[PDB]
Amino acid sequence: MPDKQLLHIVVGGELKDVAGVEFRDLSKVEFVGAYPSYDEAHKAWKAKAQATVDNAHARYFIIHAHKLLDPSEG
Amino acid sequence: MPDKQLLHIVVGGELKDVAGVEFRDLSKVEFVGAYPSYDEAHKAWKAKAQATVDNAHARYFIIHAHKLLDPSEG
Numbered sequence: 001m002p003d004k005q006l007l008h009i010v011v012g013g014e015l016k017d018v019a020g021v022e023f024r025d026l027s028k029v030e031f032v033g034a035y036p037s038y039d040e041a042h043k044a045w046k047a048k049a050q051a052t053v054d055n056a057h058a059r060y061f062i063i064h065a066h067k068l069l070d071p072s073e074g
Numbered sequence: 075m076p077d078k079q080l081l082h083i084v085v086g087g088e089l090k091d092v093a094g095v096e097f098r099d100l101s102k103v104e105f106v107g108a109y110p111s112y113d114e115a116h117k118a119w120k121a122k123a124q125a126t127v128d129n130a131h132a133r134y135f136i137i138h139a140h141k142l143l144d145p146s147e148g
Contacts, residue, residue: 006095008143009103011083021142022076026108029083034100045145061142068095068135069082071116 009034010044012060024057032060083108084118086126086134098131106134 013029016022023029032048035041041062048060067074087103090096097103106122109115115136122134 002090002094002096004096005100006097007100009085009100011105011139011142016079017076020076021139022079023108026081026083026110029108031085031105034097034103036100042145045143061144061146063083063137063139063142065085065097065137068085068133069119069137070133070135071119 005036006066007034007036007038008041008062009065010041010048010060011063012048012058014055015057015059018057019059021059021061030058030060034065080140081108081110081112082115082136083139084115084122084134084136086122087132088129089131089133092131104132104134108139 010032012032014024016024032044035044045060045062052058084106086106088098090098106118109118119134119136126132
């Protein structure tokens with residue numbers, strides 16, 4: 001009994017540059033989480049970007065969790 | 075200095091299968107974090123996997139954050 005829930009999980013945090021994806025601190029990489037659809041995670045990207053005004057350099061985006069980087073087989 | 079610090083972040087959580095990437099739950103996807111080198115993040119995968127041998131299908135892998143899924147620029 002399989003059921004396709006696997007989606008593009010949402011990650012972000014504060015950067016060194018304003019537009020650049022160069023993370024200032026990796027403990028300050030705020031992982032937004034993972035929603036029950038990619039459509040829901042897609043909305044979460046801008047839902048965070050709009051929300052976070054107090055945040056200076058925080059550029060929240062998405063990430064591809066379709067395949068994980070295993071050095072075991074991969 | 076906008077130096078290329080960006081590396082592969084570390085994430086993990088339970089699956090519904092032994093080898094299958096069907097995340098059992100997405101709020102159970104423990105984001106291990108992100109380590110100050112790729113070699114550290116590569117080590118974090120096994121540092122977790124050997125710490126979590128008690129775990130049924132909780133496998134702690136890596137993801138390449140070199141490009142985030144931006145609906146903004148492309």
